[PDB]
């Protein structure tokens, strides 16, 4: 209950018996952090049957949004003020029988920037510790050609032409 | 069978062929050539004559910067995958990050202080 | 008691044969502590036959040896590591069995 | 309307991320290719400029009358274990063949 | 020519005795190896009673039967249950 974005809930039995019809039931297994007893799909299950009752009622109705037959099954949480009035609250996506909460485009980016820059700052502090300075010496860490080489290069090319490389 | 008597039976290890590498979609690989006559020269290759390039100093700094770069790259990849509708979405579920505390002020203060 | 110690140690060693649990422990930082390497060194008593007689899942022992190389624990923090090791394990297992079976059957059918 | 503006802000953010990534890459590559001769003034000259400019720019962009980012949500559509040569090109080599592991991981 | 032939013979001898030494190494492992057969049968039945020693007849890429104690067996497993 600390952070709903950072929780994942699963169950093996329901995994092989999973189909477009049963996705809501899997979310409904109860003891699932994402879903709640307060939702009306749960009130309906207490009563008999389920049909256009989510439109007659207008409240918390978890409904499947998009579905790929094998694994992908996205669920959306809506709050209805009246029939033909829908307000989207959140989205919980199920990949490989593993339920996650869809991250906000911005909470994800905030955490991401924080981790990267924290790493950069640790690296910077460590680098600053080692650098040592003196005005005479300059900087240090805490851890040419005699120009007679043109004739040597001429001799090198001469022996190249004389003794060819046979790689 | 009515009271089997176990005797000292010695068995030799069944190491006739080893599967050094196992590929996907079948395709077994028997890399082990079971040789020694050439293994002496193979070990002579290891012998000297005179973990990345050097990598004894600044290893921590190098790894830290690499990790920061990797996180940056992952975020960029996700942003480029949102840049289009290819295997992705962007539906704005009218929500509201409600913080039930005075977290902001305290956090700001402590952060600035440290 | 010593019985509970034996049972918990057996369960832990049999659980170590899981790459997911190994990646769990590596990410959570349990391997970096110098106490866990000594615990692993103590856990080597399972190599004896009298102790190996009670091991239901034998795939752990070999894995345990790798954990002593001190380079296996520095790596494996990645999830791709667990991916690859479980891939190779299940591949060896299933391919060995079913490939022996299929090779025998196919050769017997083709030679006829 | 706001969707057009939202997309514009998203593209600006993409640009910023790309620039920062490039900078970091060049920096570490240069460290590995220089090793010696590198001195504290130059190392400080590079770390500070890259990080400060890119980070300040990103925060500035995030807080200039841009769409509310907590509103929108990202939920995967299709996953196919098929080889893809276009996502490998588009993400510059990482994250190929959108499999099942990649959506919980990213 | 004699020297060359001698060197070839030496190489042959080397490979042969190296293989003989490998056989000797097997024999040294084998000597300590001798044990009760019934015990071998019981251990084989133990490791083979489940899906560990042999892949199951119908085991495709997608099975709860894993080479490790899954996660539900771990959840009831003494290990963390008693550590809690």
């Amino acid at each position: 209950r600390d952070n709903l974005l950072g929780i994942s809930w699963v169950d093996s039995s329901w995994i092989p018996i999973l189909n477009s019809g049963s996705v809501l039931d899997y979310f409904s297994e109860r003891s699932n952090p994402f879903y709640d007893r307060t939702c009306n799909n749960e009130v309906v299950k207490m009563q008999r049957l389920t049909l256009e009752h989510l439109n007659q009622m207008v409240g918390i109705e978890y409904i499947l949004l998009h579905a790929q037959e094998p694994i992908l099954f996205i669920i959306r949480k809506q709050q209805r003020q009246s029939p033909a009035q829908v307000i989207p609250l959140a989205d919980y996506y199920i990949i490989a029988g593993v339920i996650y909460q869809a991250p906000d485009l911005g909470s994800v980016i905030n955490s991401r920037v924080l981790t990267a820059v924290h790493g950069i700052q640790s690296a910077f502090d460590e680098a600053m510790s080692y650098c040592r300075y003196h005005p005479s010496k300059g900087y240090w860490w805490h851890f040419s050609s005699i120009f007679q080489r043109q004739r040597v290069d001429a001799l090198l090319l001469d022996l190249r032409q004389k003794f060819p490389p046979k790689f | 069978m009515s009271g089997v008597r176990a005797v000292r039976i010695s068995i030799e290890s069944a190491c006739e062929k080893q599967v050094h590498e196992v590929g996907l979609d079948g395709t077994e690989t028997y890399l082990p050539p079971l040789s020694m006559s050439q293994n002496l020269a193979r070990l002579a290759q290891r012998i000297d004559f005179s973990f990345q390039p050097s990598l004894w100093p600044w290893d921590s700094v190098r790894n830290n910067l690499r990790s920061a770069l990797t996180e940056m790259c992952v975020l960029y990849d996700v942003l480029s995958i949102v840049r289009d509708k290819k295997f992705m979405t962007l539906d704005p579920v009218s929500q509201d990050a409600l913080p039930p505390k005075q977290n902001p002020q305290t956090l700001q203060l402590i952060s600035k202080k440290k | 008691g010593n019985r509970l110690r034996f049972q918990l140690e057996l369960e832990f060693v049999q659980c170590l044969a899981n790459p997911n649990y190994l990646n769990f422990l590596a990410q959570r930082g349990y391997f970096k502590d110098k106490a866990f390497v000594n615990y692993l060194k103590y856990l080597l008593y399972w190599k004896d036959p009298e102790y190996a007689k009670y091991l239901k899942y034998p795939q752990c022992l070999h894995m345990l040896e790798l954990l002593q190389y001190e380079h296996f624990r520095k790596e494996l923090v990645n999830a791709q590591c667990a991916k690859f090791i479980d891939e190779q394990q299940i591949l060896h297992w299933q391919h060995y069995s079913r490939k022996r079976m299929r090779l025998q059957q196919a050769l017997a059918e083709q030679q006829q | 309307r706001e969707e057009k503006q939202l997309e514009a802000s998203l593209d600006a953010l993409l640009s910023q991320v790309a620039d920062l990534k490039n900078s970091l890459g060049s920096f570490i590559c240069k460290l590995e290719n220089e090793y010696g001769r590198l001195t504290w003034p130059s190392v400080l000259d590079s770390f500070a400029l890259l990080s400060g400019q890119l980070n300040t720019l990103n925060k500035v962009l995030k807080h200039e009358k841009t769409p509310l980012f907590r509103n929108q949500v990202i939920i995967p559509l299709v996953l196919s274990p098929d080889r893809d040569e276009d996502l490998m090109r588009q993400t510059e080599g990482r994250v190929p063949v959108f499999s099942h592991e990649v959506v919980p991981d990213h | 020519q004699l020297q060359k032939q001698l060197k070839e013979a030496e190489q042959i001898l080397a490979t042969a005795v190296y293989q003989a030494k490998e056989k000797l190494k097997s024999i040294e492992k084998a000597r300590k190896g001798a044990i009760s057969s019934e015990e071998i049968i019981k251990y084989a039945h133990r490791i083979s009673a489940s899906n560990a020693v042999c892949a199951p007849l119908t085991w495709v890429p997608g099975d709860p039967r894993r080479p490790y104690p899954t996660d539900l067996e771990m959840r009831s497993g003494l290990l963390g249950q008693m550590n809690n």
Binding site: Q68, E69, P70, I71, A96, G97 | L24, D25 | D86, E87, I90, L91, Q94 | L79, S80, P81, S99, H100 | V60, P61, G62, D63
Partner: peptide, 10 residues
Amino acid sequence: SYSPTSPSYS
């Protein structure tokens, strides 16, 4: 189609 792949998809 695409069941989670313990061995890689063929």
